[PDB]
Scaffold this active site. Structure first.
Site, PDB file in Angstrom:
ATOM      1  N   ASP A  34       0.890  -1.158   0.000  1.00 31.40           N
ATOM      2  CA  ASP A  34       0.000   0.000   0.000  1.00 31.40           C
ATOM      3  C   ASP A  34       0.929   1.208   0.000  1.00 31.40           C
ATOM      4  O   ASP A  34       2.123   1.072   0.271  1.00 31.40           O
ATOM      5  CB  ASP A  34      -0.893   0.015   1.241  1.00 31.40           C
ATOM      6  N   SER A  35       0.388   2.383  -0.302  1.00 31.70           N
ATOM      7  CA  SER A  35       1.192   3.597  -0.381  1.00 31.70           C
ATOM      8  C   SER A  35       1.598   4.238   0.951  1.00 31.70           C
ATOM      9  O   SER A  35       2.463   5.112   0.978  1.00 31.70           O
ATOM     10  CB  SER A  35       0.473   4.620  -1.263  1.00 31.70           C
ATOM     11  N   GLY A  36       0.982   3.808   2.049  1.00 30.42           N
ATOM     12  CA  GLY A  36       1.335   4.362   3.345  1.00 30.42           C
ATOM     13  C   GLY A  36       0.513   5.559   3.790  1.00 30.42           C
ATOM     14  O   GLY A  36       0.324   5.777   4.986  1.00 30.42           O
ATOM     15  N   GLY A  37       0.020   6.339   2.837  1.00 33.92           N
ATOM     16  CA  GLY A  37      -0.775   7.502   3.186  1.00 33.92           C
ATOM     17  C   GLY A  37      -1.960   7.168   4.072  1.00 33.92           C
ATOM     18  O   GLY A  37      -2.236   7.867   5.046  1.00 33.92           O
ATOM     19  N   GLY A  65     -11.413   3.891  -0.164  1.00 36.74           N
ATOM     20  CA  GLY A  65     -12.369   4.570   0.695  1.00 36.74           C
ATOM     21  C   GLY A  65     -13.651   3.823   1.019  1.00 36.74           C
ATOM     22  O   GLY A  65     -14.670   4.451   1.312  1.00 36.74           O
ATOM     23  N   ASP A 107      -7.961  -7.863   0.401  1.00 37.27           N
ATOM     24  CA  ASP A 107      -6.998  -7.896   1.492  1.00 37.27           C
ATOM     25  C   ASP A 107      -7.767  -7.428   2.724  1.00 37.27           C
ATOM     26  O   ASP A 107      -8.648  -6.571   2.632  1.00 37.27           O
ATOM     27  CB  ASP A 107      -5.809  -6.958   1.241  1.00 37.27           C
ATOM     28  N   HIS A 124      -5.625 -21.588  10.344  1.00 42.71           N
ATOM     29  CA  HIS A 124      -6.956 -22.014   9.929  1.00 42.71           C
ATOM     30  C   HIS A 124      -7.685 -20.914   9.148  1.00 42.71           C
ATOM     31  O   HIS A 124      -8.127 -21.135   8.022  1.00 42.71           O
ATOM     32  CB  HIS A 124      -7.830 -22.384  11.122  1.00 42.71           C
TER      33      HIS A 124
END
Ligand SMILES: Nc1nc2ccccc2c(=O)[nH]1
Ligand SMILES: Nc1nc2ccccc2c(=O)[nH]1
Ligand SMILES: [Zn+2]
Ligand SMILES: [Zn+2]
Lengths: 366, 366
Positions: B92-95, B214, B264, B333
């Site tokens: 992910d970009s971290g923002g 979002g 995810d 599991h």
């Protein structure tokens, strides 16, 4: 597969290497038993524990009688199926843990669950039976350290009376007496005459193996070895000698040199999660900044899976980040290291070069 | 093995199943990506993660840029060798994490390490490059929920400007542009016109895949599905559609029905250690007293190693005892369950019976 059969295949000085055959498997001695507090060897699956080379694990009765309860585990099929370990399991009597982690009398000990509970030689033996223990330890009363000759004698004498009761309790239970083994425990603090008394009484009662108890009470290695020097010889030579609660590489090597065949200690597991990793060059604290970019494995020679796949830098990161994988990897390495230690010990004795191995081990480890 | 190639092998309604080919491996879609916060999928070795069926994992940039640091991981050889996972990794970009776990401006965002730090589209892209990410996410500004049309528009518009910068930053780095892929992120809150604007701008810039951002901000599944209904179609059909931070079985099935190809979520791992276990009959809290003597596996059909070896009663015991193995077994599991879910999804779509599968799944799960 007999109920219990200890065979010595080779010797060198007081050291011995051989095997203990039991129904659930063979135990190679000298042996190190990984400790499984609450029905688990912390941070490791049973297969992983086995993969490191362990032939037997130690189960803590104390915690199990409290949670999830002996009766309950017996109801679920026994400790073996409960935790997924089908090999031998040695269970301590629980008295020790109680006196550590209370009303004491000749009948046993009463304590409060950190609920009230009564633990006697009979109840201890029954609990271990309910758990399905392969090697049952006699219920004893540990002697605090330091202890006066008088106090040490009273406790040792009480332990011997309790050893007789454990013996009878064990023999009175058909299924247990026929499929499991019983180990007696020598007491007497650091006093030679008491140790001798305890040894003879124990021998008089007769057991499948003899443990040297009361030696993980804060004394230094020097004092422990001194005690082992005269204590182990007092025990029957044709039966296993088990040094309880003693681990730490150099401690183990010294005890084997003095006739010990079995060991158990939490250091491998506990120190692991704490960040301490054992190597042939001595222990290291992986959390130390010097390992932040160290690409080498925990130990340069270790053949464990951890040292084959991950670097000190990664494990350094995981431990400092509080990551569970860090605890898993450190524990697997340490237990694997301990088993590797025992293997080198068994091989050197079989080859009549254990003395040299011990010298070389100390030279590098320190 | 091409840099990036998405092929759709079958469809049913809006749902699609196919593959994404990358240098480090093939990703079967719809795909669920296990989340690896600090360079680890909590409580699991990479081999175990792979054994459950995962083709790709998600790495959290936020935590890594802070500890152990992007530059450092690049110095040690990259995230892949660092953690022992040689397959694709999406970062992910971290923002997002910053705006969750601060001074914001058109240039980026500044924050205090829970030290001061600056994170811009350029720095984000560079960090992911240093980590050696296979699928790089554009640096965006998430829109709080609830958000007004005006605020949502400003943020979405800023995200689009940032998407262009991410794109150029990515293309300007030879090695990265040639070996990795870049995904753009759609914003616009729950407003259809903004989503459309974001989609067209994203399409205008051009990316290897499109994420719907979002949507893990507290809205109910009903509102999320409503948004997905009109949002996903706006995205290019020949590229992957990634619903960020969305997991939870029933959420996944509904999103696939609406055209999502990638997922995810921390729920599998986080809920696991929390004691929640996913089963085809819905989730269960293993800590509940009703499982203390339950000899059945977590789930009656699951084929994961945990359900083959241990009972709910044992895992119940471990979790209540605070044992690390409990966290390990529950997490294995759950992730295995998630992968099994995705497999049944991919198969039903390939076989033109995904609609029926979805209906049957909901009937039993609820
Ligand atoms: N029962 C028992 N357990 C022990 C464990 C470690 C060290 C010593 C002892 C001991 O003397 N008795
Ligand atoms: N960068 C980014 N990451 C996310 C993760 C989960 C949900 C949503 C988002 C999102 O909108 N942007
Ligand atoms: Zn190792
Ligand atoms: Zn399972």
């Amino acid at each position: 597969r007999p109920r219990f059969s200890f065979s010595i295949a080779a010797r060198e000085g007081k050291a011995r290497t051989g095997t203990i055959e039991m129904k659930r498997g063979v135990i190679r001695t000298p042996a190190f038993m990984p400790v499984g507090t609450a029905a688990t060897v912390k941070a490791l699956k049973p297969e992983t524990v086995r993969a490191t080379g362990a032939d037997i694990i130690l189960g803590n009765t104390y915690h199990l009688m409290l949670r999830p309860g002996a009766e309950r585990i017996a109801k679920l099929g026994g400790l073996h199926s409960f935790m997924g370990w089908d090999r031998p399991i040695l269970t301590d009597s629980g008295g020790y843990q109680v006196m550590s982690l209370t009303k004491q009398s000749e009948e046993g000990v009463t304590f409060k669950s950190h609920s009230r509970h009564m633990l006697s030689p009979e109840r201890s033996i029954e609990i271990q039976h309910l758990l399905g223990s392969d090697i049952v330890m006699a219920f004893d009363e540990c002697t605090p350290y330091p202890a006066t000759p008088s106090r040490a004698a009273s406790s040792m004498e009480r332990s011997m009376r309790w050893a007789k009761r454990s013996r009878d309790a064990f023999d009175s239970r058909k299924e247990q007496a026929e499929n499991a083994a019983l180990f007696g425990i020598q007491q007497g603090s650091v006093f030679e005459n008491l140790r001798q008394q305890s040894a003879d009484a124990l021998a008089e009662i007769g057991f499948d193996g003899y443990a040297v108890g009361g030696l993980a009470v804060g004394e230094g290695q020097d004092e422990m070895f001194r005690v082992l020097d005269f204590s182990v010889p007092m025990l029957p030579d044709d039966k296993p000698h088990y040094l309880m609660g003693v681990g730490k590489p150099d401690d183990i090597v010294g005890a084997v040199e003095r006739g010990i065949d079995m060991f158990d200690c939490v250091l491998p597991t506990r120190s692991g999660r704490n960040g301490q990793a054992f190597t042939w060059d001595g222990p290291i604290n992986i959390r130390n900044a010097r390992f932040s970019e160290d690409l080498k494995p925990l130990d340069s020679e270790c053949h464990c899976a951890v040292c084959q796949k991950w670097s000190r830098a990664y494990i350094h990161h995981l431990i400092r980040a509080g990551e569970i994988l860090g605890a898993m990897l450190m524990t697997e390495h340490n237990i694997a290291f301990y088993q590797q230690l025992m293997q080198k010990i068994r091989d050197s004795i079989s080859e009549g070069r254990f003395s040299q191995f011990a010298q070389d081990f100390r030279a590098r480890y320190f």
